[PDB]
Structures are given as C-alpha cells and as structure tokens.
Amino acid sequence: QLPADTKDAKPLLKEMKRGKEFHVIFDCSHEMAAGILKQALAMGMMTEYYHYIFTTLDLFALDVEPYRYSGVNMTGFRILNTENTQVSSIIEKWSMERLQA
Amino acid sequence: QLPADTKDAKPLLKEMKRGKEFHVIFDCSHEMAAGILKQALAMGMMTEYYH
Structure with a gap:
C-alpha cells in the first residue's frame, strides 16, 4: 500500500x-x-x-x-478509442476549449 | 569517444549497454559530466551495477 x-x-x-x-x-x-x-x-x-x-x-x-x-x-x-478519425476530431476540439x- | 558535433550520447551509451560495460572511466569536463548522466538516466544505466 x-x-x-x-x-x-x-x-x-x-x-x-x-x-x-x-x-x-x-x-x-x-x-x-x-x-x-x-x-x-x-x-x-x-x-x-x-x-x-x-x-x-x-x-x-x-x-x-x-x-x-x-x-x-x-x-x-x-478504452478511449483514439484510432477513428471522427473520435480523434472530437478530442482535438476538446483541446480548443481548455485554453485557460 | 563522445560525439564531436552533437551533445547526445544516446548512440554511444546504447552500444555500452549492449556490450555489457559496467565499469566506465569518463574523461570529461564537469559541464559535460552532468550532460552524460542525464542521458544515462534517460536510459537504464543508472542502476546498482554500474561504476
């Protein structure tokens, strides 16, 4: 422990x-x-x-x-399915929402 | 011999790990002695085997 x-x-x-x-x-x-x-x-x-x-x-x-x-x-x-183009596009849009x- | 142009000793230290060389005598300055040990810690060569 x-x-x-x-x-x-x-x-x-x-x-x-x-x-x-x-x-x-x-x-x-x-x-x-x-x-x-x-x-x-x-x-x-x-x-x-x-x-x-x-x-x-x-x-x-x-x-x-x-x-x-x-x-x-x-x-x-x-489990995060980072191989699909559509799934990876959403994660790229997630990084454009956490600028600060 | 350490590489002349670059200061990255990864191609040197990989040949030293593969050849089973656990006893090393560095002839360097102390500005480069700190540079090798950060490139020997990024590889698996800071163990209890090496002297």
Whole structure:
C-alpha cells in the first residue's frame, strides 16, 4: 500500500528493490501514476528488468519522455478509442476549449 | 569517444549497454559530466551495477 499522508514512495520502493520485485501492478489514478515514476526514476528502478502494469485507463495521458529510452516494460489498457478519425476530431476540439488551463 | 558535433550520447551509451560495460572511466569536463548522466538516466544505466 502507498503511504496515506505523504506522497513520497521512497520507503515503499526501497522495500520493493530489496525484495527483488520486478513485476508490479499499480492500482492508482493517473495523477499519482506520474508521481511514482518520478520517484522510481530517482531510484534505480526504471531499468530493463522491471515490468509495470497499470490499472488506470489513463496511461495514454502520461508525458513519458524520460522513460522512453530506458527499456522499461510499461503496460496498461485504454478504452478511449483514439484510432477513428471522427473520435480523434472530437478530442482535438476538446483541446480548443481548455485554453485557460 | 563522445560525439564531436552533437551533445547526445544516446548512440554511444546504447552500444555500452549492449556490450555489457559496467565499469566506465569518463574523461570529461564537469559541464559535460552532468550532460552524460542525464542521458544515462534517460536510459537504464543508472542502476546498482554500474561504476
């Protein structure tokens, strides 16, 4: 379990490195899924050994630039049908409604 | 040798990961020593194996 009060998972991820746990299933929101990976990159846990399955359906909204060349095995689902031209046109119109954010 | 023109050592560090080279002696300045480590953290080479 992630810690309740703080948002620093260094005491959790150090117990996961020491116990040799290379296969992790995170049950988080995507606001906290980006928070663990910056605390898993500050530790030595973004290697080619680790596999991360994420329960959330908003993995596609992560800004994964630094984890892209590491060779990490991030996996997850997506229900948002971003392949259709008609569906992708509505999402482009959604970005033209959130200018002040 | 680090690349001359660019300051992106991704084609160098990928050949060092693939060749299993865990013991590296950098001959750099400290302005470029900080530049390699951000390009060694973007790859999976800041582990407990590397010296």
